[model samples]
Target: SENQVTKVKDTNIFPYTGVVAFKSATGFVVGKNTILTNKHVSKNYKVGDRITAHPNSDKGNGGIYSIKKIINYPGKEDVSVIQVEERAIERGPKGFNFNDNVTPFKYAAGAKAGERIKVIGYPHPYKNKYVLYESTGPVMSVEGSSIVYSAHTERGNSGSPVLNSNNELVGIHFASDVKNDDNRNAYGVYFTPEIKKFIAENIDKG
Candidate 1:
């Protein structure tokens, strides 16, 4: 039986609202007009690319915002910070401010093996459009910048946030061994002091 992923009934809640949907990836709000995602997933992300704030559906959910800038971590880790426009942009209705609707995620102290956690994102091949899903499991192991977990995830789950039981951010999901589905495990970069500092320095001050 499956005990991993479930459809998030309400995308407007605290932690859920923090998860944003990209074209085919995931990102989460971390600071004022700032978002965190994987370097690989956002490497080619352009300034005008769009992001939907905690979208539950393709229409009439949270507002759509445009990317203004992206800061890649100049390290060996798969992490990056995205700076979004102050308000929602065209192709959809505008005037919604990110600060008004989205609650940025607070980083967890640390994560260890066997600890329960949740991975929330818009996993690909999903039958529904823009529906957020949450995968629950325990951390399988932690090794330096890379941490392995038993949470079930897919391609679209890249850039997802790994949350502790308290819904605090622990790590950033980047990849999974899909070939080993029966024993599939997801990998992410744990937040270190250095990474936290980088994010803090780059957050939009406005």
Candidate 2:
């Protein structure tokens, strides 16, 4: 599968464990010391959940990071950010940048019924205790304001950023149909536009 071809960068594959540390399972970083991940990833953790990341994760191929703070999502966005110490961000991979002049990869404006698109994300099936799988796909349809891309994905790929050919952030990987009985094999997956809006609005917030 094409999805299997994409690999995590040696510098970027960090054990993203314990980054979440609050109810609603969210984590984020502000300035250079914060971390942002999903809210559910920390639902069970409280104000102080022992957190740690693989210090030698790169050498070991992959490892987990400790959690220090979980910032809940604001209204309407199902997203959150976590805060790690300054040292943590310095230790982890460099984060993504958001520039006003830098346009994110987006599906063609007025994307139509059969327009092609692509998606990228980390799929769970190819993931293991040591490695994370990332994949990409093209767009298949545009139903109303929603988009469907023909990229392969799996669980744990949620929150993964989607990109176009230009590799600009277009969508976020969330869910797809994997049932054999359904038409899952023919179509791509989808994420709500709201996700894009959230990333755009809060990519720099604390």
Candidate 3:
């Protein structure tokens, strides 16, 4: 069934993921103040564009937040960071390991070929409306920090995390191809040590 996934929900996913929405695409939060998504998702956004988190899901329990600032990764990286506005989520609920604050995901460099993986993000407007969804697959290959995986993904799933069995973050969901094959052949970028350092620095000062 389209509705049934390995795991997906408004309250939380393993890393305590949530939907982050700008005018056009979807994203997710890293913590209460920090968020991560595809740079393309925030292409038209500005310092005051006011993106939101968990739009219509989890209501009074927890949902939605205003974005304060956005910082894109330099160079060829397709990723970006969004700072959560102060008081962005008044009813923000505790998530991830049941922590009061959203837990920052633990990441690594490589996701080897044929290794199991899954993505948790907002995908398919209709499917995303209720709660974030998850799709599982195996690593097809890793090409220069780029992970070509068999995981299922769509437009709104950008910025979703690709995680392994330990639930450790191994990559960030990005795009898919269907010309020669199908959308089943999805792609993403893994966060190596250098990439992680870059992201951490930007979210603080920028």
Candidate 4:
């Protein structure tokens, strides 16, 4: 059962959570000046493309940055990395420091049981233009490489981070079977040990 989505007001909490305009995908800041999103979100984008991050809002530290390099995670895994100018990502409203308190979910986490999980990102077709939305649900099950859960999401949610109830990242939301099938189950790729290591190795060092 997919839950209904609600507006994410007071959205300043997640400075690392953001949306990429070029491909209309949701992503989050993983490391210093490093961003992660699904390969499907960045497949059409290339190196040297100008990328701007909107941290829940467009003003303040949410400024434009350049994609210095594109590290396409070479594998069957549909994930990729983007290296931006050093310190190019600014803070959110009131200068919230996204890097200071990065959630521990950066590592791979188990997607088990009734524990709650949340998905936050812009609902796009650009609803309200600058607003971000939040959807929460319980993890009913976990398949081999994907977390099958019930969460309401829309077209522009491709790269939205899937966080455990404790706000720890479990995986990145990539697809859904609501329309195709009928279960309303959404699928996400977890940041497993290997995937996490891949990200650590690919992000550019300052």
Candidate 4 lDDT trough over 10 residues, lowest sum: 95-104
> How would you encode candidate 2's per-residue C-alpha lDDT over 11-67 as one tens digit per residue?
222222212222122222223334434454545555445333321223331122344
Best by lDDT: 1
TM-score of each: 0.92, 0.53, 0.79, 0.80
lDDT score of model 1?
0.85
What are the per-residue Cα lDDT tens digits for candidate 4 across 1-206?
45557776554355234434443667667776677888888776776665555544544335556677777777677788877765435443333333332322444347786768888766574543555677888777776667877887776787778887566788888887757543477778866667889999976676
Query: RMSD in Å for candidate 3, one decimal?
Result: 4.2
Q: Which 10-residue span in candidate 2 carries the lowest summed lDDT?
A: 95-104
Q: How would you encode candidate 1's per-residue C-alpha lDDT over 79-143 as one tens digit per residue?
A: 89999998877322324777777888777788899899999998873554787899989898987
Best by TM-score: 1
Q: Rate residue 138 of model 1 by lDDT.
A: 84
Q: Give the alpha carbon lDDT tens digit for every residue of 105-130 in model 3.
A: 67654578988887876676554344
lDDT of each: 0.85, 0.39, 0.66, 0.66
Q: Evaluate model 1: give its TM-score.
A: 0.92
Q: Report how far residue 164 has shifted in candidate 1, in Å.
A: 0.9
Residue 179 shift from truth in candidate 1, angstroms: 2.5
TM-score of 4: 0.80
